[PDB]
Design an enzyme around this catalytic site. Structure first.
Site, PDB file in Angstrom:
ATOM      1  N   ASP A  70      33.469 -76.269  20.180  1.00 15.59           N
ATOM      2  CA  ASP A  70      34.011 -76.870  21.398  1.00 15.59           C
ATOM      3  C   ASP A  70      34.355 -78.359  21.317  1.00 15.59           C
ATOM      4  O   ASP A  70      35.251 -78.854  22.040  1.00 15.59           O
ATOM      5  CB  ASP A  70      33.026 -76.721  22.505  1.00 15.59           C
ATOM      6  CG  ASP A  70      32.848 -75.282  22.933  1.00 15.59           C
ATOM      7  OD1 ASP A  70      33.817 -74.481  22.844  1.00 15.59           O
ATOM      8  OD2 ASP A  70      31.723 -74.896  23.318  1.00 15.59           O
ATOM      9  N   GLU A 197      31.778 -77.392  35.355  1.00 13.97           N
ATOM     10  CA  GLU A 197      33.133 -76.904  35.379  1.00 13.97           C
ATOM     11  C   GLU A 197      33.602 -76.462  36.778  1.00 13.97           C
ATOM     12  O   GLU A 197      34.013 -75.312  36.943  1.00 13.97           O
ATOM     13  CB  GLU A 197      33.242 -75.725  34.398  1.00 13.97           C
ATOM     14  CG  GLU A 197      32.795 -76.118  32.997  1.00 13.97           C
ATOM     15  CD  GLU A 197      32.889 -74.977  31.975  1.00 13.97           C
ATOM     16  OE1 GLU A 197      32.748 -73.760  32.337  1.00 13.97           O
ATOM     17  OE2 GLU A 197      33.078 -75.317  30.799  1.00 13.97           O
ATOM     18  N   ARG A 212      30.033 -73.473  38.239  1.00 13.57           N
ATOM     19  CA  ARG A 212      29.311 -72.615  37.312  1.00 13.57           C
ATOM     20  C   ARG A 212      27.868 -73.098  37.139  1.00 13.57           C
ATOM     21  O   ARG A 212      27.637 -74.250  36.695  1.00 13.57           O
ATOM     22  CB  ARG A 212      30.021 -72.603  35.952  1.00 13.57           C
ATOM     23  CG  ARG A 212      29.192 -72.198  34.772  1.00 13.57           C
ATOM     24  CD  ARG A 212      29.932 -72.450  33.492  1.00 13.57           C
ATOM     25  NE  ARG A 212      29.207 -72.042  32.272  1.00 13.57           N
ATOM     26  CZ  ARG A 212      29.743 -72.005  31.037  1.00 13.57           C
ATOM     27  NH1 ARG A 212      31.053 -72.287  30.840  1.00 13.57           N
ATOM     28  NH2 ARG A 212      28.980 -71.655  29.997  1.00 13.57           N
ATOM     29  N   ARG A 291      33.565 -61.652  28.915  1.00 19.88           N
ATOM     30  CA  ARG A 291      34.808 -62.286  29.374  1.00 19.88           C
ATOM     31  C   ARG A 291      35.971 -61.346  29.172  1.00 19.88           C
ATOM     32  O   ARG A 291      36.939 -61.668  28.410  1.00 19.88           O
ATOM     33  CB  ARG A 291      35.037 -63.629  28.629  1.00 19.88           C
ATOM     34  CG  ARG A 291      34.053 -64.717  29.152  1.00 19.88           C
ATOM     35  CD  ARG A 291      33.884 -65.920  28.225  1.00 19.88           C
ATOM     36  NE  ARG A 291      32.943 -66.929  28.765  1.00 19.88           N
ATOM     37  CZ  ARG A 291      32.723 -68.131  28.250  1.00 19.88           C
ATOM     38  NH1 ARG A 291      33.343 -68.544  27.149  1.00 19.88           N
ATOM     39  NH2 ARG A 291      31.853 -68.933  28.818  1.00 19.88           N
ATOM     40  N   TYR A 325      38.089 -68.516  30.970  1.00 20.82           N
ATOM     41  CA  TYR A 325      37.846 -69.361  32.127  1.00 20.82           C
ATOM     42  C   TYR A 325      38.938 -69.045  33.177  1.00 20.82           C
ATOM     43  O   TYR A 325      40.010 -68.484  32.848  1.00 20.82           O
ATOM     44  CB  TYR A 325      38.008 -70.801  31.692  1.00 20.82           C
ATOM     45  CG  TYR A 325      36.787 -71.458  31.092  1.00 20.82           C
ATOM     46  CD1 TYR A 325      35.696 -70.684  30.649  1.00 20.82           C
ATOM     47  CD2 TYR A 325      36.726 -72.853  30.961  1.00 20.82           C
ATOM     48  CE1 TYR A 325      34.522 -71.304  30.114  1.00 20.82           C
ATOM     49  CE2 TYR A 325      35.592 -73.477  30.386  1.00 20.82           C
ATOM     50  CZ  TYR A 325      34.498 -72.661  29.969  1.00 20.82           C
ATOM     51  OH  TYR A 325      33.413 -73.272  29.454  1.00 20.82           O
TER      52      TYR A 325
HETATM   53  C1  SIA Z   1      32.005 -79.890  27.003  1.00 21.24           C
HETATM   54  C2  SIA Z   1      31.852 -78.509  26.440  1.00 21.24           C
HETATM   55  O1  SIA Z   1      31.547 -78.312  25.275  1.00 21.24           O
HETATM   56  N1  SIA Z   1      32.070 -77.512  27.293  1.00 21.24           N
HETATM   57  C3  SIA Z   1      31.954 -76.125  26.869  1.00 21.24           C
HETATM   58  C4  SIA Z   1      31.125 -75.449  27.956  1.00 21.24           C
HETATM   59  C5  SIA Z   1      29.634 -75.640  27.708  1.00 21.24           C
HETATM   60  O2  SIA Z   1      29.285 -75.084  26.435  1.00 21.24           O
HETATM   61  C6  SIA Z   1      28.808 -74.967  28.799  1.00 21.24           C
HETATM   62  O3  SIA Z   1      29.344 -75.310  30.082  1.00 21.24           O
HETATM   63  C7  SIA Z   1      27.349 -75.402  28.726  1.00 21.24           C
HETATM   64  O4  SIA Z   1      27.230 -76.753  29.186  1.00 21.24           O
HETATM   65  O5  SIA Z   1      31.425 -74.054  28.027  1.00 21.24           O
HETATM   66  C8  SIA Z   1      31.971 -73.545  26.811  1.00 21.24           C
HETATM   67  O6  SIA Z   1      31.151 -73.952  25.710  1.00 21.24           O
HETATM   68  C9  SIA Z   1      32.019 -72.040  26.873  1.00 21.24           C
HETATM   69  O7  SIA Z   1      31.090 -71.436  27.452  1.00 21.24           O
HETATM   70  O8  SIA Z   1      32.987 -71.452  26.345  1.00 21.24           O
HETATM   71  C10 SIA Z   1      33.380 -74.091  26.626  1.00 21.24           C
HETATM   72  C11 SIA Z   1      33.383 -75.597  26.854  1.00 21.24           C
HETATM   73  O9  SIA Z   1      34.118 -76.237  25.805  1.00 21.24           O
END
Ligand code: SIA
Ligand code: SIA
Ligand code: SIA
Ligand code: SIA
Ligand code: SIA
Ligand code: SIA
Ligand code: SIA
Ligand code: SIA
Ligand code: NAG
Ligand code: NAG
Ligand code: NAG
Ligand code: NAG
Ligand code: NAG
Ligand code: BMA
Ligand code: BMA
Ligand code: BMA
Ligand code: MAN
Ligand code: MAN
Ligand code: MAN
Ligand code: MAN
Ligand code: MAN
Ligand code: MAN
Ligand code: MAN
Ligand code: MAN
Ligand code: MAN
Ligand code: MAN
Ligand code: CA
Ligand code: CA
Ligand code: CA
Ligand code: CA
Lengths: 389, 389, 389, 389
Positions: A70, A197, A212, A291, A325
């Site tokens: 991510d 989010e 969320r 998902r 998402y």
């Molecule tokens: C900043 C960041 O890494 N956000 C990531 C969040 C966090 O992992 C969760 O909200 C836990 O905080 O959700 C994802 O990982 C996911 O679930 O696909 C995608 C996204 O990129």
């Protein structure tokens, strides 16, 4: 050109019509398409654009390998003309980082991106294409934000941000911006126990963010913001129709003021709802575990009635295809007397659910409300994974 | 529109926030991206753009082979929207040649390129995208200039140029332009013994150019220019913190008026600093020998105090990654009461340091000052050379 | 804002400075670059653009095979921002056909293309992007025109066209246009015995077209046009310095009024000259047999003196490299008190001179006059033919 | 800017001149060109654009395979600058779906697309780039529309739609739009027995729509619409010159008020005609059986006389080449006293006629009338199918 005021009510919605679809993975199989995730759409007086976090590589490039990750120094928020697929040639870099939000206030567009290591991230706030303000991490654990558009009223654009654990109490703040400058900062208040989010929209001078809860709840937290007084309250969606992903079966009754636990194996996904008494619609994945699939459910009084159930439904993506998402946006500048609800669904392709390839990316589909009774079909990504093997 | 006047002071700076990164080599591994070097940024009333010297081929093309070579009839200064990677599709040709500078005076942009054979180069000066003046070589040995932006005041844009040996005394001139026409020419004066690739910025009516002494000093020369009188002085950065590359260890005392020699094996690299009393920041490669890593050191009074050392630092590129040229720029049209320092780092990939490929190119990162104390991480190029083998 | 008037005199010219170079063939080895030939440049109040006849395929595409052929239903006139290479993504289709001319009258651009079978071609004359007028062949033998820009005065833009044998007497007309409408048509008069591919420029109310006599002369025909009276005269360049290709050695005396014949093995190539008494320059290929090399020669009184020879020269492309067509253009909207001469050279690569590939295409280099004595070097194409094998 | 009205008469037409050709299959053999079909052109005050239904994949991409298929969630109406080929980088998404129409009312552009499953399709009507109205299928069998431009008069733009069997009586409606809002709906009336894919144009305040009867007739239905009273009538083209594809030989007399049966093996093809007394032109494929070749026939009184035959012809695409759909458009904003007829021919390559490839796509050619007697040649697609094997 003036500041947008949230002076209109939500349009009645009975059905959802197709707005845009970029078929990015299909096209990106052979054309130079950037890998992304965490997309959305946002509008301004001239039209609507698509937004996403690029991974700094094309889908067919060898650097697509490893894009399940991510956060990296190679990600940036990019925007492009609605309907096109995102390539290195048609995309505008809004800001650098791995989490973002963006909105137009009627005059210019504000875009925000977080970047940096886990224990030391910072946000940069941009307005009209220039950097205005910087905000250091306050809890030292992945300062992060909505991943869909913010909403402005009389120049004031509130933004929901979180810093702290993904699986425990975290420090969420509502920061109110005007021309990218901080007007006020509030700590999260109310009964929501974890926020991530947020998907937000406005109507009748009120902003509602459906978020969320990654810590406990399979029901979604709701934050109600007054952008004039710059104050908020929070709680959960009351409906027994649970909309987070990896949820248990819907119970006999929801819970307005506490999380409902359960679900396997995912703690959360980004999502949304429009809450307007009888005219309320909740989105969720069709699968309770994963998902996959996406359905819109009309659930009258879902915001206030723990007994509220669906009275109509519409499949957006069938349960044989992958989703991701989902979030809210509105074309506040449309020539209508009401603000018409729209939303997008991120169609994730690749890892981890499709491990025959080395990358993770997505395409986008977006739809808006109709008063009519419209027929529908599944708007799945449409790409053949075997072609990428 | 009006002429820019350098009426504002430098903003206070305590750390650096991310402004842009184009990830050009990652993307160029599979999209049509031009081979470049000697990049930089420059802004105008509407925003900022990226610039660089193309090699007239794409990174994956067979003509990328041989691009370590600095000068050819196939190079040109190109510019493009900040953050995008430079492709044959989104780049504007500013002028033809293999050394350049550029700046916007508030009304239009001036761009200057040198081209031709070593013993007979000439500069063409452009304004508003039309050629205005031409300047023949005066010393018959690679007439050359800044490789980063010039700066303007009331329409007068000084430019530092050099013609003559790279490894012995040469003939430097400061040429004062207005609307691309020569207003005055001065020969270099003062204590700087060799001048190349000056990185210049403006504040409080004074233009400072921090340059490269390729002949003797590991400390960088500094030229101070009065754009209204069109006169200048020169000396060296006083600080013991040496910032050129291939430098020896920092000595106990620097020297304001003479070069501090030593270091191995390279005579120099383009670099920069912002000099404003206690609010002074020096950039340098982390390695004292090679163009690897990049760090910002806050050294109060570096400009005047031979004993000045660092009170803070921020790693921009870790020392396990390649850097390159670095230079100054400022968004002089920002909606702030002070001019905020920005800089870029050229992230050179390929030859000579990575000889598993036949080419030489770069990506870019850029950052600007923040009064806050922001966390940081490495903004290294991010491409995997093995993918290019 | 207004119709251009040719009131200014030509600038004094002592050497030639680089204006632009697109490096199309180098770039097109990997990027998606269209196959072209017969390029030129043309300017308007905003800037200058490059033009050429595409062959309706990319350079690396399998359809580039057989592109030596001059006429097909797949060619069109395209224009694009000066300096970029012509791709399917950044080019504007001016009109469809396989011979063309174009020019801006100060208000809008007129573009003309001929198309159709040899015995029945037709011109379509466009203005401000709309088709205005059509002109059928009058001699049933490849109706054709300039292959470089036309010139306008007070909204009247004369265009030279030929219809008839390439190797015998033909039928040439001068058609005067205004807003794409025919104002007057004239049959060629004077002493020029054959006219093709005129390269035209204006100064002091007078338009001179230097052309290609494909039937007899190795000296170039000169048409002088009065755009207000809409009348003309013709003769040959007087100079003994012969400038067409496949010419004999320059004789002791040229001939103002009759062709100087000879040469082997080709009848002609498009070329140009600037004629202004002492301030006169003639371009030609260096080789007297083939289209290789290119040199500019200052030949005082070339237009009136049969004994005039060169007093200076500039090599533009060395004789070890291929050249091609050459033609005149001026940026009539420059902020100057005189009109400064410019020219381009078409750099032809591939067949028939380079038969190891199946295609024929070109790149472009362009230069303009300077009052200074500037150094020079060869601006050849720069592509390595072996990379296309 | 004002609402366009159709008061002008049709221009006299004696031959056809070339307007545009995009060579999309030749180019798309190696560049990134979208797979399309059902193309057309439409103009506005600024110029003209090309439109078509994308398949959401490039021609060379692996998703091209299977594109013979007419309807999928991956199609969308795209427009681009006339003459360019449609790529992912220069195309605007007008709307999502697999059947469309579009037209500019002088103020803004309306675009309409149908999408969804066969039994539950829906139309979304866009105006000025925003969604305005939705229309659910009324007969539950592939709701569909023109596949060429609609026409507007004083703010009112009629559109012809069909829902129902392709091989039997269906339910056709005329819907009259103003700023994307429904002003009126009418059931089809008159003697036309089946209506598909109308090609429409306006003149003298009247809109004529020449359509495709896919049920019975090898002669083409004609619908006459008054855009001020918002009413219509229908019948068939009177002429014996039959213009549908898969038609029998032309009989000695046509039939104004009933379908003429026969021809094999295809039930119909979208086509067009201009009907203006003596100044009448009919287009059709050259082959009576298949979509090959294309000819224009001037047939005086085709709209009213069953014995009307051709008095002149022009071959647009020779019968050794593939053609496809054809439709009408006019540049209603030309600077002329009359409206000059234009038309396009879709040039289908691939399946089913060229089964050596897995795909179906097309390129485009477009021509407009001329009062002159211009020569002509074939404007076939020009790609070599072998290059795609
Ligand atoms: C900043 C960041 O890494 N956000 C990531 C969040 C966090 O992992 C969760 O909200 C836990 O905080 O959700 C994802 O990982 C996911 O679930 O696909 C995608 C996204 O990129
Ligand atoms: C896209 C897809 O195939 N989804 C299927 C998923 C996934 O296979 C698993 O979640 C993989 O872990 O399994 C289901 O039971 C579900 O969760 O709804 C059925 C659904 O059709
Ligand atoms: C005009 C020119 O060639 N400039 C080159 C300069 C000179 O070589 C040195 O400044 C010595 O004068 O620095 C480089 O070579 C280098 O160090 O990588 C790059 C640059 O292209
Ligand atoms: C990018 C990189 O790997 N840099 C390494 C360099 C290079 O290997 C040499 O400079 C090659 O000449 O060596 C170091 O000792 C140094 O210079 O500090 C350590 C550093 O990590
Ligand atoms: C319309 C046309 O075909 N023009 C062609 C002309 C004619 O052949 C000659 O002028 C003889 O008329 O010159 C060329 O062929 C040539 O010599 O390279 C190129 C050009 O395409
Ligand atoms: C580009 C090039 O190679 N030019 C060479 C030509 C060509 O080989 C022939 O003209 C082909 O017929 O031959 C020369 O004698 C000449 O013409 O001056 C020498 C020149 O170097
Ligand atoms: C909406 C739709 O599918 N339209 C299709 C129509 C219908 O099949 C016929 O008009 C019968 O209704 O014509 C085609 O199939 C065809 O003949 O090539 C192409 C087009 O895509
Ligand atoms: C493009 C092409 O080759 N057309 C040929 C067609 C097709 O082969 C068949 O229609 C395939 O069904 O057959 C013809 O008899 C015809 O239709 O007039 C001759 C024509 O030359
Ligand atoms: C097909 C491919 O490129 N695979 C690479 C692999 O070589 C490497 O070990 C791994 C870890 O970086 O990333 C991936
Ligand atoms: C892989 C490749 O292209 N190598 C070429 C090589 O053949 C040539 O000797 C060298 C010098 O020009 O340039 C490189
Ligand atoms: C490599 C290639 O495609 N060669 C083709 C060849 O097969 C054909 O004979 C020639 C004639 O058109 O065109 C070329
Ligand atoms: C070359 C190729 O990809 N062919 C595929 C084929 O494997 C598949 O059977 C068919 C049906 O989906 O689609 C096509
Ligand atoms: C049609 O447009 C013309 C040109 O603007 C105008 O003069 C005329 O009044 C309009 N006619 C009608 C009937 O609206
Ligand atoms: O590096 C500059 C300064 O950074 C901080 C501390 O680590 C100091 O000890 C150091 O002098
Ligand atoms: O080229 C023109 C002149 O250039 C210089 C000298 O080389 C002269 O011999 C020559 O006449
Ligand atoms: O093609 C239609 C017409 O063309 C012309 C003449 O050849 C006529 O005899 C013919 O009727
Ligand atoms: O009544 C069954 C039905 O009720 C409602 C929702 O809770 C659904 O999840 C469930 O399937
Ligand atoms: O629409 C059909 C559906 O309506 C609701 C309920 O009454 C269900 O029992 C029924 O199947
Ligand atoms: O209202 C739709 C549907 O709802 C449920 C039942 O009450 C049905 O009788 C009814 O048809
Ligand atoms: O909300 C979608 C939902 O509607 C109801 C049933 O048709 C389910 O099969 C479907 O999942
Ligand atoms: O005298 C040699 C020299 O004279 C002059 C020109 O005619 C040239 O072509 C020639 O080479
Ligand atoms: O012709 C005189 C002179 O002109 C110049 C060059 O072309 C020389 O080679 C030549 O000698
Ligand atoms: O103008 C070019 C000309 O210059 C002089 C000499 O170098 C010649 O050999 C050359 O042909
Ligand atoms: O001579 C017969 C002739 O009549 C007319 C047209 O219908 C043509 O298609 C046909 O060939
Ligand atoms: O039909 C009469 C005449 O019309 C025209 C052309 O289509 C000819 O082939 C035909 O003979
Ligand atoms: O209309 C075209 C038509 O013209 C006539 C004849 O040449 C036919 O062969 C041709 O089909
Ligand atoms: Ca949860
Ligand atoms: Ca040094
Ligand atoms: Ca000749
Ligand atoms: Ca039919």
């Amino acid at each position: 050109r003036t500041f947008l005021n949230l002076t209109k009510p939500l349009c009645e919605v009975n059905s959802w019509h197709i707005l845009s679809k970029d078929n990015a993975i299909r096209i990106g199989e052979d054309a130079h398409i950037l890998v992304t995730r965490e997309p959305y759409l946002s509008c301004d007086p001239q039209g609507c654009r698509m937004f996403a976090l690029s991974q700094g590589t094309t889908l067919r490039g060898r650097h697509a390998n490893g894009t399940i990750h991510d956060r990296s120094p190679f990600r940036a928020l990019i925007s492009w003309e609605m309907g096109q697929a995102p390539s290195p040639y048609n995309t505008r870099v809004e800001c650098i980082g791995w989490s973002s939000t963006s909105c137009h206030d009627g005059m210019s567009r504000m875009s925000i991106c977080m970047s940096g290591p886990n224990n030391n991230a910072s946000a940069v706030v941009w307005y009209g294409g220039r950097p205005i303000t910087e905000i250091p991490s306050w809890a030292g654990n992945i300062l992060r934000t909505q991943e869909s558009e913010c909403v402005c009223h009389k120049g004031v654009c509130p933004v929901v941000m979180t810093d702290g654990p993904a699986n425990n109490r975290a420090a969420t703040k509502i920061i109110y911006f005007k021309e990218g400058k901080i007007q006020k900062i509030e700590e999260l208040a109310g009964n929501a126990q974890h926020i991530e989010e947020c998907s937000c929209y406005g109507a009748g001078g009120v902003i509602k963010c459906i978020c969320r809860d990654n810590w406990k709840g399979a029901n979604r937290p709701v934050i109600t913001i007054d952008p004039e007084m710059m104050t908020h309250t929070s709680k959960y969606l009351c409906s027994k129709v649970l909309t987070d992903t990896s949820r248990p079966n819907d119970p006999t009754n929801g819970n307005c003021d506490a999380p409902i636990t359960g679900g396997s194996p995912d703690p959360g996904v980004k999502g949304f709802a429009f809450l307007d008494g009888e005219n309320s619609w909740l989105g969720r994945t069709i699968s309770k575990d994963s998902r996959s699939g996406y359905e819109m459910l009309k659930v009258p009084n879902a915001e206030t009635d723990i007994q509220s159930g669906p009275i109509s439904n519409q499949v957006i993506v069938n349960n044989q295809n992958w989703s991701g998402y989902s979030g809210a946006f509105i074309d506040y500048w449309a020539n209508k007397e009401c603000f018409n609800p729209c939303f997008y669904v991120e169609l994730i392709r690749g890892r981890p659910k499709e491990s025959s390839v080395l990358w993770t990316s997505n395409s986008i589909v977006a739809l808006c409300g109709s008063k009519k009774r419209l027929g529908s079909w599944s708007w799945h990504d449409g790409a053949e994974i075997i072609y990428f093997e």
